[PDB]
Amino acid sequence: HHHHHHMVHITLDRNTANSWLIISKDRRQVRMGDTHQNVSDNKERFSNYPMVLGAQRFSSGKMYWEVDVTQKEAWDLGVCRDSVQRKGQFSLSPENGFWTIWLWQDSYEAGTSPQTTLHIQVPPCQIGIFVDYEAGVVSFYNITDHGSLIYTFSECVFAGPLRPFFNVGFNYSGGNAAPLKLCPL
């Protein structure tokens, strides 16, 4: 792909984070803490899952960013409507305002309803995310495997401003403490 020149500088929005997340000072890294991180509750926070939004809102144009997932067992990544449900249980689907992929139990899936099997020969250490607002496209690329295509959501009905979306996943196994990191341009 040749999307690198639409690179945008993504930072994480602390106010949207699940209360167990630790976001780095530069707002480019997030990990699961071993306890409540001593913040007040607010209506923005994801309550049930270890999720956080980027601060950036997109309503036009072409945007590209990269996320480091090295040594993680579980994570979700992509974009979502600014207006997604924050509280309680929900599925990651375009009907609920999410355009995501994930790693779970040694398999990679796209957040369709129902979910779609991905075919990845080289486990990614970095993921590229490309959004074309006007075209209605979200695409994911395997940076570790020379930028090979992982998945394209097309005919997307965004129906609002988009935000970068992250889930560091639970760490019940003790094998998923590693952070998500926004890679430098």
Ligand X SMILES: CCNC1CCN(c2ccncc2)CC1
Q: Which residues bind ligand X (CB under 6 A)?
A: 76, 92, 102, 104, 115
Residue with tokens 């129902």: 114
Least distance from C-beta 170 to ligand X, angstroms?
9
Shorter beta-carbon distance to ligand X: residue 133 or 176: 176
Least distance from C-beta 66 to ligand X, angstroms?
20
Shorter beta-carbon distance to ligand X: residue 58 or 166: 166
Least distance from C-beta 164 to ligand X, angstroms?
17
The token duo for 67 is: 């996320």
Residue in 91, 83, 70, 87 with CA at minimum distance from that of residue 143: 70
Tell me phi and psi for residue 167, to 5 degrees.
-135, 120
Shorter beta-carbon distance to ligand X: residue 66 or 76: 76
Shorter beta-carbon distance to ligand X: residue 24 or 107: 107
Instruction: Give the whole-angstrom CA distance, residue 151 versus residue 142.
Output: 10
- The residue number with the shortest CB distance to ligand X is 104
DSSP code per residue over 132-157:
ETTTTEEEEEEGGGTTEEEEEE-S--
Least distance from C-beta 113 to ligand X, angstroms?
10
Shorter beta-carbon distance to ligand X: residue 114 or 184: 114
The token duo for 185 is: 């341009």
Least distance from C-beta 1 to ligand X, angstroms?
25
Report the b/e string of 116-125 with b at 16+ CB within 10 A: eebebeeebe
